[PDB]
Amino acid sequence: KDPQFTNVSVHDPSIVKDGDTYYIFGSHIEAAKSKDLMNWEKFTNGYTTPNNKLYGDLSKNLAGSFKWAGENDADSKGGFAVWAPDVFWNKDYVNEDGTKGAYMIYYSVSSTYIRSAIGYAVSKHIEGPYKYVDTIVYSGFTKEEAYDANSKINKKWTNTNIPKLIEQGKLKGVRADWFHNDGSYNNRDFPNAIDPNLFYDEKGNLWMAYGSWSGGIFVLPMDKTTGKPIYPGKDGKTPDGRLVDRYFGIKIAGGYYQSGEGTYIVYDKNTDYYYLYVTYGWLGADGGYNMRQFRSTSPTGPYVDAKGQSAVLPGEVDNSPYGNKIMGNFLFERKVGDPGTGIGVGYVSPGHNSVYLDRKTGQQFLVFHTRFPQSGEYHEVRVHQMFMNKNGWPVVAPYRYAGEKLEKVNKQDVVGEYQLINHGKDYSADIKKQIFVRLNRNNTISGDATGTWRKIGHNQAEITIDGETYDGVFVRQWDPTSKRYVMAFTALSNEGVSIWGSKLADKTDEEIVEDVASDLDLGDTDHVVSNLHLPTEGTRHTVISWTTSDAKVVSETGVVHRPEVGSAPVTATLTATITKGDATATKVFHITVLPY
Ligand SMILES: OC[C@@H]1O[C@@H](OC[C@@H]2O[C@@H](OC[C@@H]3O[C@@H](OC[C@@H]4O[C@@H](OC[C@@H]5O[C@@H](OC[C@@H]6O[C@@H](OC[C@@H]7O[C@@H](OC[C@@H]8O[C@@H](O)[C@H](O)[C@H]8O)[C@H](O)[C@H]7O)[C@H](O)[C@H]6O)[C@H](O)[C@H]5O)[C@H](O)[C@H]4O)[C@H](O)[C@H]3O)[C@H](O)[C@H]2O)[C@H](O)[C@H]1O
Questions:
Q1: Pure H helices in 158-226
Q2: Domains delineated in the chain
């Protein structure tokens, strides 16, 4: 009855459901399918060309886009760069043969941090092969003629699709503000055209939101029929002050060179909210990708967080205060004495997500790529279920989706000790690990934090710590370390902080110290040539202190002193005294140290 998982490495996944089957489409022409959001099979060949699984002859097909960026050019020297797509079924799209209905993949191509463009391709079948249509949004264009190093491409704006639009009367003409004084692209205020996301709204209209760092995230209204932007055509401001551009659209997030990418927007027909997901930080293992969360009553904004702050920054400022941090770097550390093996389950730089909102059950899933502790830049896809908390915010489940659903939750299954992770607001390469609290039968919270708690209705959690209230739900989770299903909670404060709870198994101190003793292993102590690592700490704050029988062979801290060449091997005995509260255990380790 244990869950089975089959993983795949798709960067920047973007989920879509097609009948019985779930599909995700990532960067680098990578894509996979699942029937259960747990077992994925990849079906693509990547950047292979031709016979490219998605695009066929990659270079000739998408050449309309590669005239501008993303092929053997600058940062895509000797390769391609096809980034962060989105895929959906457009029942309204008029084909080349007059019939209506097609799959659309909206993709990015890029060659610098600013020179890039969004284009799209259509197809009879969702697995491809897709067939180019147009290139609709450019960035990194210049006021006069110019070139990037190791690039032959004239960057002047007259090389984009802008002149054609000025002809068709869709734009007045070039906006001066797009350029600095030196005539270069003004990405302080204007976007980098990648990461398109396609969403329908409440009345069934189509929209594309897009962008990464630089000037921010923009949204454009989309002609359901052709697949092309209905450009604003005139500059202006939104009623609340947000920039509207004639070409780029409406600014809904970010700005002033700060991070933010992987836009995904969903209309919730029940809460009547548009939820904006965005990822902060830098994608690699030392860059700290966060996922951030905002909402608006309009698809155009203004999008705000649980604190009621704008996703659009006021200037070059720390962006970390803004947006619900719904997931950062974390590790449910498997300390000495915890069941299972390994370091525990953790993520490094999770993010660039899509969302699937099921029409039948109303269950919501978060879908993202992530790296892992101790694994460098290796990454896999992960799915976490989201549940709607009492304030109209989806709250993310602590663990990957394993078939769980909301249930009636009984108080006696909630009471106990919890490992708790508080994702906070700051972010870095720091991995956040658990503290130890308990939810007591008297509805107080004691341990590494102090406060009160309430179950409300079938499963609503309310957690109060030091005058902050975190609202979310109690829900059952798969803990892959102890290999059991566990009680868990996730809750969100109106500071936009998320806290996670995973319930430890019930144990008394006398049981903890004996679990610690049985787990405490120094490895092979028979042929010792290096220093030994002696853990001073076991699970649930158990102190482990050490003594040695002979400091000349090995110290209290595990530093060994090998005999000089041509000596007899030497031995000492290390004693671990293990104490949790009033309990005590002892374990002895016999050490043999080899001479040089
Ligand atoms: O073999 C069978 C199967 O294979 C196995 O599969 C495993 C495979 O491995 C995966 O590869 C995935 C890896 O990740 C890919 O990377 C992801 C893609 O690229 C991403 O690029 C995004 C970039 O990120 C952002 O950078 C952020 C930011 O933007 C720029 O900012 C700098 C810039 O400079 C400033 O100047 C301003 C000055 O300031 C003012 O004072 C002055 O006036 C101005 O002059 C400017 O303002 C600043 O913005 C910088 O880039 C950075 O700072 C940026 O948005 C993007 O450029 C993209 O998001 C993502 O898609 C990596 O390439 C790939 O290797 C495969 O997927 C997987 O299949 C499997 O195991 C086997 O079965």
A1: 162-167
A2: 4-403 (2.115.10.20), 404-505 (2.40.128.10), 506-596 (no CATH)
